[PDB]
Amino acid sequence: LAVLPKEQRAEAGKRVNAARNAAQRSYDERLATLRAERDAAVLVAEGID
Amino acid sequence: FQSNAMRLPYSWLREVVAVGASGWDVTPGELEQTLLRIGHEVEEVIPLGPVDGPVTVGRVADIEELTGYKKPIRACAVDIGDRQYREIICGATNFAVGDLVVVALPGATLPGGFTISARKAYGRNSDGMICSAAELNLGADHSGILVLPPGAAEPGADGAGVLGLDDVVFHLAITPDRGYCMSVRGLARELACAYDLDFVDPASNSRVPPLPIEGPAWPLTVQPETGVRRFALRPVIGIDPAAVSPWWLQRRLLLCGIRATCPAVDVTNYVMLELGHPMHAHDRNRISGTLGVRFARSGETAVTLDGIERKLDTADVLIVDDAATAAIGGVMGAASTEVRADSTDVLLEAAIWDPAAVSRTQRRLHLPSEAARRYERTVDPAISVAALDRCARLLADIAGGEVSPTLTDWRGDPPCDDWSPPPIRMGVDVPDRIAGVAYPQGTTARRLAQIGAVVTHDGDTLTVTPPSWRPDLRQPADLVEEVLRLEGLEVIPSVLPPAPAGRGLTAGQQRRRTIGRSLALSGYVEILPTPFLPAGVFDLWGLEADDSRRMTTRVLNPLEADRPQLATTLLPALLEALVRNVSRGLVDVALFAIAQVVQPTEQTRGVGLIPVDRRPTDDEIAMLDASLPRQPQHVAAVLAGLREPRGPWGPGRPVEAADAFEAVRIIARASRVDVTLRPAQYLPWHPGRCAQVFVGESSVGHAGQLHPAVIERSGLPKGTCAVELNLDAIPCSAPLPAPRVSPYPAVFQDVSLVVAADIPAQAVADAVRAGAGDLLEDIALFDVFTGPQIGEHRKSLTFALRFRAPDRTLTEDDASAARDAAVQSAAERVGAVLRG
Amino acid sequence: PSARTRIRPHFFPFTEPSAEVDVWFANKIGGAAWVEWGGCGMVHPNVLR
RNA sequence: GGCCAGGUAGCUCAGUCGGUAGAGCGUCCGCCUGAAAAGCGGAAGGUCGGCGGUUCGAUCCCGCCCCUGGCCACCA
Ligand SMILES: [Cl-]
Ligand SMILES: [Mg+2]
Ligand SMILES: [Mg+2]
Ligand SMILES: [Mg+2]
Ligand SMILES: [Mg+2]
Ligand SMILES: [Mg+2]
């Protein structure tokens, strides 16, 4: 976006911001889901004596 | 803008001491030791100067400003005496042509080391510099050069002589019980005491009679309950606004940390420094109607004479007139009546405000003025008119005008006429007894009269009436301190007391040492843990909202605004310390702490003030203790990285949960109690590697590996393990064993039992002990096996058994019977199946 | 037995007479000097009461 | 509570006044070694102290706040 001319950046940045947020949002939920599974696996794992 | 301690030049002090004791003179070094000896902390001894060579008075004859540079730059010709002129480039801006200034010419040496040679600057030559008070080591320069008042000296006069540079400035930190020592008056009196000198009090009717009192001056009303003790007013009419203070006055104000402004204000500060009674000057033409002293109303404001608005509260005492606030009483005057350039008629104010009221007000408003810090330590009410008269005469002397023969002197309702505190009765030998020194006969009466008290002597009792400037003298112990400090503490001998036979350390105290020793021997390093929890730690742990650890005592004003909660558990602080050490290169770490925690309850709240003139009753004592949060001693430990370092013997052993269980057993052995460990779920521990620790059937804590999410969210190392026990819930114990050593041989057998995988190994061993009875001398697990021969969710345990009789050799069949009874006990209590 | 101490009159609300004890601290930052060690005195009669 | 300077990676610090932000040491991998380290080669790791606002987009601009170091000040 820094190489773009000054008046072409506004419209390009919108697309870039929306595309990056879409992928960032998908990462957050997957991180969460995999964290929840890790903690639920901790609960049912057999303990040590 | 405001200074701090008691500064005064030696010459002034000497002058006042010398009136009574002609020619008294001591070195600064001796004076320092004498002051320390009698109880005045000497923070600094500042010899003025020194200067060498041509540092002389000069007069600015011509100024030429120099444009093109960052600041205004003046090219001045200065008359340096004997009709000679020097060009000098100077930076400052607080002088005009005609001013007497102090020049340091080529060949001079300034404190300290700055050799003055003719230098160039801004395309012009400079035969020296015009000095500031700082550059001369005279005072604080106030970002400007020093102008001497007209007539102070001639151009060419020797600067060191004119400036009195052979003086020495003492900076003392006066203790708050000695308000009378915030002046030359009190300090001179203390020295006359310490040197046994005849003393002339500078605040008495002395050398000139008091001023006449032919009628009332300005009218005054004082609101009841304001704590004003005295309020005197006397005007000086028709002073010369163009007058300035003479050099001797300006210098003394400068040496004492006070910047000189104009004669009316300079005189109030000078007399305040000399006598200890703060004085205020009002422009008399700017007062509207009756002067009133009253409390401030809620939300009221006042503009002090620095142009700053102050939010007032209702405990602040004001001086007002009909139109505006004249002063925040005893703290700072208001702009409305302040003396200024044009003022010709001055109304001088000598008042005594309530010490506590001034203390509250000045500290809340952050105005520790020269007046305020004197009134909060109390001011001698007997000298208000004496200081008033001294002030008025001095001001008429400097600036002209007439001292009016009128005086308003309000001395309370009803008028108080004797300002001495109540008399104190004390045995004549009481100082001797407290000191453990037999003082020469008559020492106590001599010393107490020296400090100004009236002493009457009947039998072996003194009746001692303190002087009005000593309101700190209220009981015999106060008087004892006076005698002892003047005689000097060095005469008191050093004698160890006879202690009765003590009982030494308590059991709890001994046990804390033993636990400490043992953990340190096992590789743990002690930290002393902060009681302020990390921000949101229990959220990072994921604790339930009703977890008791979240019920914390809170600090109103903590070190870190985000850490006001006091710790209910030591683990947060230990874990923070763990991260700290690991972050600095020491990845293999074991830390412990032994410290109290803070656990409030329902009854954790305030208890109102109880009068301190009696013992609190046993019910009040118990209510005070019951109102505090519970504060039990805990012991805790954390470990991460390698538990055992690598070496020639192989690569070393990573920390594991079993190391945390061993730390529990180290603590229990040190405490000489038995513990049992049971599986538990309890954040922040891993629910499958967590033990709850029991003594008897009382829970005392938890141990094991921390939960992986807690580790991830707190930035802790993988595998961190931890222990925390409540020491106060571990009972003391005094085991008295009486072993009997059987001379007969023992029998060794082993036994393999299969149990469900969730049965703890220790519950099997206990069942084996239970069934086997008295022949069983020892049992030790040595094998846990879960291979393919063992069903799923089951495990095979094998124990080494040692049997021995106290009175016979056993047969193999005798042990086998005991083993078979153990096997049956294990089937009955834990479902064990004899391995086949 | 060789360390340098000194006792001098001072003040505390709960003692009378009061004193402060300094020790000669050779390694003080900026040069050796007396440094406050602690406070002391005879227990104030208001405290006993 | 006053003033000055700061807050950037695991540690010690540069740097950017709107779209790429780093170094030295610390961590990880390959070659190498029996295993290491060095050397060569190559990676990971930062919400640029917090929260708002402006903006398509803020470590950087605006506002409010918190904290660190130093120098004052205060005091049991
Ligand atoms: Cl089986
Ligand atoms: Mg006293
Ligand atoms: Mg056998
Ligand atoms: Mg003190
Ligand atoms: Mg850092
Ligand atoms: Mg927007």
UniProtKB/Swiss-Prot annotation, chain A:
Compartments, record wording: Cytoplasm
Domain of life from the UniProt record: Bacteria
Family membership: Belongs to the class-II aminoacyl-tRNA synthetase family. Phe-tRNA synthetase alpha subunit type 1 subfamily.
Summary of subunit composition and partner proteins: Tetramer of two alpha and two beta subunits.
Protein name (record): Phenylalanine--tRNA ligase alpha subunit
Organism of provenance: Mycobacterium tuberculosis (strain ATCC 25618 / H37Rv)
Portion held of the full protein: 48 to 96 of 341
Curated annotation (Swiss-Prot), chain B:
Pfam families noted in UniProt: B3_4 (PF03483), B5 (PF03484), FDX-ACB (PF03147), tRNA_bind (PF01588), tRNA_synthFbeta (PF17759)
Catalytic activity line of the entry: tRNA(Phe) + L-phenylalanine + ATP = L-phenylalanyl-tRNA(Phe) + AMP + diphosphate + H(+)
Top-level taxon in the UniProt lineage: Bacteria
ATP-binding listed as a keyword: yes
Record SMART domains: B3_4, B5, FDX-ACB
Compartment(s): Cytoplasm
Main location: cytoplasm
Family annotation (SUPFAM superfamilies): Anticodon-binding domain of PheRS, Class II aaRS and biotin synthetases, Nucleic acid-binding proteins, PheT/TilS domain, Putative DNA-binding domain
Binding residue positions for Mg(2+): 472, 478, 481-482
Enzyme Commission number(s): 6.1.1.20
GO MF annotation, one: magnesium ion binding
Similarity annotation: Belongs to the phenylalanyl-tRNA synthetase beta subunit family. Type 1 subfamily.
Subunit structure comment from the entry: Tetramer of two alpha and two beta subunits.
Note: Was identified as a high-confidence drug target.
Protein name: Phenylalanine--tRNA ligase beta subunit
Organism this protein belongs to: Mycobacterium tuberculosis (strain ATCC 25618 / H37Rv)
